[PDB]
Write a protein that binds this ligand. Structure first.
Ligand SMILES: [Ca+2]
Ligand SMILES: [Ca+2]
Ligand SMILES: [Ca+2]
Ligand SMILES: [Ca+2]
Length: 143
């Protein structure tokens, strides 16, 4: 963890421009900008409120660190799921068709008829294209 807080410390300093130990809507603002995004003060204020646990109006290390921890898990999630999607989507076309789910389902040890695969697509197909896209996929995986 020692070398972990250090890493986190490094990330915190980019934001803490004047090094007083807190991040302000203005400091958050200059970083967003240096990144090519010019948020309004109102949008900046919402970004701070979300992380500000004690309501003093700024974010300190412990608050950042704790925001950061939780969110690093969820990006390690979206990434596992973004993976499975890619193995399913044999023709990297953005969509999982019946032919594709059937092929991979057979490699998982289940030989399904076209009818059973059809039923799988249906169940998860929202926009009704008869295909499963990333969006439909995650809702199917997670929820
Ligand atoms: Ca500061
Ligand atoms: Ca605070
Ligand atoms: Ca495909
Ligand atoms: Ca669809």
């Amino acid at each position: 963890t020692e070398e972990q807080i250090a890493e986190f410390k490094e990330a915190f300093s980019l934001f803490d421009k004047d090094g007083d130990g807190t991040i302000t809507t203005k400091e958050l603002g200059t970083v967003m900008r240096s990144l090519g995004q010019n948020p309004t003060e109102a949008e900046l204020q919402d970004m701070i409120n979300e992380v500000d646990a004690d309501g003093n109006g700024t974010i300190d290390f412990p608050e950042f660190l704790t925001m950061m921890a939780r969110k690093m898990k969820d990006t390690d999630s979206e990434e596992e799921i973004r993976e499975a999607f890619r193995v399913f989507d044999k023709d990297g076309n953005g969509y999982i068709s019946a032919a594709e789910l059937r092929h991979v389902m057979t490699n998982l040890g289940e030989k399904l008829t076209d009818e059973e695969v059809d039923e799988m697509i249906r169940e998860a197909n929202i926009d009704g294209d008869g295909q499963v896209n990333y969006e439909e996929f995650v809702q199917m995986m997670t929820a």
